[PDB]
């Protein structure tokens, strides 16, 4: 309404609309800041699955949501 704050949640900088950026659940991350909480890969280009405050790629998601005694 009054103003808008779409700054990066990773570094804190100010994400401008005139550049490749990301926005999920309301937050905003830089195309270089938005990474995966599993392999630390830049999902700013590759697909992924937004989980509990955690961004996991196709695999990082299907793997964590997979049934198995796997310790890690």
Residues at the contact surface with Zn ion, assessed by CB under 5 A:
8, 10-11, 13, 30, 33, 36, 38-39, 57, 60
What is the Cα Rg of the chain in Å? 14
- Report the distance separating Cα 68 and Cα 44, nearest Å: 29
H or E stretch at 50:
strand 48-51
Residue 56 Cβ vs Zn ion, minimum distance, rounded to whole Å: 6
Nearer Cβ to Zn ion, position 56 or 68? 56
Nearer Cβ to Zn ion, position 2 or 64? 64
Nearer Cβ to Zn ion, position 3 or 47? 47
Nearest 5°: phi and psi at 59? -70, -55
């Amino acid at each position: 309404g009054s103003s808008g704050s779409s700054g990066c949640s990773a570094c804190g900088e100010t994400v401008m609309p005139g550049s490749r950026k990301l926005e999920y659940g309301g937050q905003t991350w830089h195309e270089h800041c938005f990474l995966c909480s599993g392999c630390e890969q830049p999902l700013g280009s590759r697909s992924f699955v937004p989980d509990k405050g955690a961004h996991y790629c196709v695999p990082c998601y299907e793997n964590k949501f997979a049934s198995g005694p796997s310790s890690g």
